[PDB]
């Protein structure tokens, strides 16, 4: 089997992609945030807490027939963001572009935190990342990608997230077709829960390649690229009036800036993400302080790739046995 499903921008800046999933007899549609580093399938339901419901689709299990309680199962999570929701635990189908998995764990929020309230445009999660992440409790469960492997034609799914744009995640095939050249693939560390890499180095603009090792992790749920603060600086460096701002929390820069290109490298290939994905507009509307897309990992304990590296790629999640990531140009 196979599945294929467009990813589209909830905004302006990109600062999220919704997927439209299937959940449910009949089915329920909701828009959920496919997230690489993390491993629970969560939904706004019928059980979310009234007031902490904005504008969200829910999933109502009572109006689905092959919902079936969980019996007894829990589930609680904290993102790095701060966020966090918890719940309660369904089984029933799930379908994502035409692949259907039948006794997924779909994860009801009973609670969620103020950022997923004030999100209107986002339903859910959909992890992606190992099950060994998992937080229901007692019995641990699989995720959608997990549980359809075995009847995927290959044990892969690709995420193409596009700029400023629609996108796609395949799911059990490589489209040939969506990637220039060739896909240079890495060694991954499940050690940690997550697809962690270990990228080849960086450059700024124009400038040399740096050749270092930088650990990683592959995260679609993830809007910014998080690297150590070394290679931050010597980006930033090179953007006149930028500078680091506690007040805001991070990089800014000014508005009137161009900014150059960064580059890693995945082995001997290297990926470039255009100065252009890396602006996130004014700080507050109308300022002339612009937010950077790049920013320090000090204080989070991981580098993180996430949308704004992997958006400039066509991204292989190869869940062999043994797993490797894989990049390509686009």
Sequence with gaps: STGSATTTPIDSLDDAYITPVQIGTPAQTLNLDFDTGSSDLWVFSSETTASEVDGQTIYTPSKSTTAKLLSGATWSISYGDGSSS??????????????????????????????????????????????????????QQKTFFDNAKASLDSPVFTADLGYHAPGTYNFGFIDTTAYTGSITYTAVSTKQGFWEWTSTGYAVGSGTFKSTSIDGIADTGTTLLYLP???????????????????????????????????????????????????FGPISTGSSSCFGGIQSSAGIGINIFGDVALKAAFVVFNGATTPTLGFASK
């Design 229 to 279: 603060a070394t290679v931050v600086s010597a980006y930033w460096a090179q953007v006149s009036g930028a500078k680091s701002s506690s007040s805001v929390g991070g990089y800014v820069f000014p508005c009137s800036a161009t900014l150059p290109s960064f580059t890693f490298g995945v082995g001997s290939a290297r990926i470039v993400i255009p100065g252009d994905y890396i602006d």
């Design 86 to 139: 918890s719940g309660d635990v369904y089984t029933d189908t799930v379908s994502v572009g035409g692949l259907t998995v039948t006794g997924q764990a779909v994860e009801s929020a009973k609670k969620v935190s103020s950022s997923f309230t004030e999100d209107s445009t986002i339903d859910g999660l959909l992890g992606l990342a190992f099950s060994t992440l998992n937080t229901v409790s007692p019995t």
